[model samples]
Target chain A: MTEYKLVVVGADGVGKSALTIQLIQNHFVDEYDPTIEDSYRKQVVIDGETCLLDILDTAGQEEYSAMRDQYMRTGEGFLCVFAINNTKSFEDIHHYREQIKRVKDSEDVPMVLVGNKCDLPSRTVDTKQAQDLARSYGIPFIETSAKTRQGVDDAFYTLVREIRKHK
Target chain B: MTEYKLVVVGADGVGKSALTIQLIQNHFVDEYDPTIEDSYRKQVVIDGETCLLDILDTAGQEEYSAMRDQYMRTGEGFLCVFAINNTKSFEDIHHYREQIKRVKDSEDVPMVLVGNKCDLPSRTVDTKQAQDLARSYGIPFIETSAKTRQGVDDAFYTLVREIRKHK
Candidate 1:
């Protein structure tokens, strides 16, 4: 079994926590205790291979601000996220991108730009804008709503494949 | 006079809008005039020079979320303000910083880290911690008691100076 490490980083209240929970909690697996706060490890099958998925998430903890570089250092891949309806959150994604690049100190890394809360039809960030941004960064992008679970598995699984390719 | 578009941004009830008025309504000005539903333009003298400081403050308007990028795109500098007593508000400042950086498309943009409401001396964010955060961000930090007019002008003036240096 292969263990893939991932993180969800984004502006506050943009549903980074929700997206991570939607991926980890929605799927049924108990290989690792799921009660850990803000961190999760699960065993899953991807492309017919049994594997471990290790995930770390943030929910605007008071201390996370000072410790971002520490977690950014540990993550093997990332789901950089923003709310589709919150334009400011979308604008905030690049800082997380730059932080990852700075910490990884690598030109090539496994990453995805996630626009969450897509279930809301009253949106501010359009599809073209996000797709164009994904293209601009040469990274994959996807739209999702943690509540509806649309494109949720694909989002994390895409990161798994990206990590695979990176490896 | 050079017009500097400045914005006060942070989480709701961190006194984001209150600090704007604390500066504009309390301070002496050359030609302080009017508002377009919380937007204020005031001509102030900073470092012996006169200029117009156009400020856009939000009192958590529901419609403001839709147009965050519009103002973020327009502002030349920002006051990343938080209530000194509210740690949650302090935690929310990074999102504003990231949004500013993304919209300005430049890390070199002008900004100041402000801990407002110092008169309520039972503080959550200590001065040194705030100072350290500013140092971490490579920007200036200041504390103010809007109720007492302490550090108000200097906080606003600091941004004007940074904006001058930014250009």
Candidate 2:
């Protein structure tokens, strides 16, 4: 089985926990709970091949910013999450992208831009805007909602595919 | 059926189209299509009451800022969206909230702070931070992912309920 270490980074309350938990546990959480860098391991089938998926749900609070580089260094693939509802989270994605590139010392890193929380209204950022940003960065972009379980599998599976492709 | 007119406003690419289209049509769109101002009418059931929900999805581009006042004037409730990923969009929400209050000339206008795009990773905004802001404004706060249809119904229905309460 191929082993993949994926990290989920985003601003706090953008549903990082919800997305990660839903992906692994198949549940939706209504309340926002702060995360302090939790890791989950599961066996996932991608392309009919068994793979061990080690997911790291990082803390999005500024206080945990100092520890991000370490996670970046250890991760084999990254899943960058931003709430579509929060523009700041989306804008701050650059920082995470840049830091990962800088720390990993690779320009063609396996990554994806995830727009989470698609179920709410009054969206400030458009999908086109996000896709454009991801295109500019040479990465794939997908929107997901943990509550409805939409695109949750696609997001993770896409990352796995990208990681395998990268390898 | 009670008719309620609501508007969706935020920075560009916040998934306004996806949210409205998904709510009304029950489908998730993968591509990003920039919108001008799309109006959708749907018969919805909220709190055991049937109502005609008229939703106006506004463009988040800066050029359209001038036309917002007119929409605000006609809207009975507002669903202010900001991408949890984009800090600028989140910051700009204050302007939308303030403008709506100013135009309505009422502090008790029905409104909600909707943080959209919660499916993406690398978010910059915090849920607590968003909740605190909503609390400060005395409005409800919710996060949604249009792609996954998470909280999409709740955001609009909550606004409808609030509008009904206001009336």
Candidate 3:
């Protein structure tokens, strides 16, 4: 089985924990508590290829900061997660994606910009803007809902596919 | 007026000179020789702005090589050109786009991948493939008939727009 060191990075409470748990456990997580999980590694098949995603959860902290970003130095790919309903979180996505690029010392890192929490009715950040922003970086943009599992699997699956292209 | 230094790059004889001359002189050059030109700089307007494009003529050069790529260090953007009728030329496009990125020492360079010589009867590089490739790099792809001036203006105009996004 192929393995990918995938990290979920974004502002806190944007469903970083919610989406990650949904993908690994096949269910939505509300008011997440990480102490309940034993392992982040999950084996999943995509495009007929077996992949073990060694996921890293960044929800342990409260807000955006680079001090805890030391994990980026070790991961091969990332899901630059953000909430669709929060303009601030969408803007902060640029920071995390750039952070991954800066620390990786490469521009074309295997990463995807995710607009999560689509279960919410209203959003300040629109889809076209998020799409154009992702297109600007040559990365994929996926909308996800941890509560309903919409695009949750594709978000991680797409990131793994992007990482495979690196090889 | 804003000035942009844009270079057209690809394997030789892929209509690099043809497209540039067509955009500048409003006519196709059946057989090109730069000895006929007094200036490579031309003023063009796009999106309600006047842009003086100091275009570079790379048609004088031959196949892929980094020896003559010092010009990339100075250009603000590039048109990674290739011939649609020639699969070899189409494949060599990767070399030129990557070359632009390398010489600029940045992954996110303002650039466009152009498929020229659309006036030809048959093309080995299909449009969908070219579009997907452009999407992968987050760059725009345009097909042009340097002879009929189909996308000649657009190729340059789009590159200028990409450069403006930097500011």
Candidate 4:
């Protein structure tokens, strides 16, 4: 069995693929696409335990709802991202989360509310707002920058650890 | 005939959809799917000239290469974007440009290289380097912020004017 499977959801151009490349490849490809070519499976070792990281890099568009529904059906863990500079992206969390809940037909899966592009504080959405949103949903939240590699690893690993704790 | 058809291309979370939505809707939805829906289009008159803005909000993942190709096929202009704070998103311009050339069989389309998220100067990639890259690619370049609406209309409208002049 896989150690963990995670789906990253956010509006288009919110840097979901950039975050994925930074976490999985440890580097950024300026040309990274945000749609799924296929699901990628990777194995990582943490604290002497082997964990499988199943990643679904879903497209950030409206036409791929069916595909997103398929990914949501797995009902594992979620990494809901929004750009720190764009408040509209932060607003999108409700739609993505509702879709996930609808598809899974359960609220058991854990979600990590990630405020990406934290490296750019001047362009930030309100920190208090993001924190409050996560609180309202009863989920953990973090700010990360895939560009600087800041909080990228922590975001994923923390989500993994949190999921394990509940499991 | 359509005055110009432009596609906003960038890695996820870089502000493509938000910029488009802000221009088209003048309002923002909190959560938006990246490429889950068909491309969104609008019509705008710029400099007293009527133009239909066909926005191909394509996917950010590799699997959606075909869709990207399809959009590239029909588009006469591009608002290729990268986050000013992220070097990787900036670098992907070359690959995306190449993809456009490969699919469209020409490199002559008018393109505006956009350095998005410029509202954050501290996290910005070198402006000089970004300009140099755009120059090398032979495209007009602008630094923009979709949040503050800075340079948002200017970027798209400028490209529209350029395309009009060329056509």
Share of native interface contacts present in candidate 4: 0.00
Provide the TM-score of chain A alone for each candidate, in the order shown.
0.89, 0.98, 0.90, 0.91
Runs of candidate 2 with Cα error greater than 4 angstroms are: B1-167
Stretches off by above 4 angstroms in model 1 are A27-37, A61-63, B1-167
TM-score of candidate 2 chain A against the true chain A: 0.98
TM-score of chain A of 1: 0.89
The residue-by-residue lDDT of candidate 2 on B28-49, one tens digit each, is 7776656655565666678888
Q: What docking class should model 3 receive?
A: incorrect
Tens-digit lDDT track of model 2 for A120-156: 8969899999999999988889999999998899999
Q: What is the model-wide C-alpha lDDT for candidate 1?
A: 0.76
Interface RMSD, every prediction, one decimal place: 21.3, 18.5, 29.8, 11.4
Candidate 1 lDDT tens digits, A1-167: 68888888887777776676567545322122111124555667999988777777654433447778787888889998888899988888887788789889986779998998888888999999999999999999999888888988999999999999999
Candidate 3 residue-wise lDDT, A3-31, digit = tens:
78888888766888778757754546555
For A1-167, candidate 4 gives per-residue lDDT tens digits of: 44687888998888887888688656654654445323446567765778777776677877666678777877488999999998889889899999888887766568999999888757758889899999988888999998899989888887788678778
lDDT tens digits, residue span B1-167, model 3: 67888877777677877787578556566754432111255556788887677776564355224444667888888899888888888788787777778788888999999999888888899999999999998999999998899998899989998999975
What clash pairs does model 3 have?
A: none
Error of 1 at B57 (Å): 44
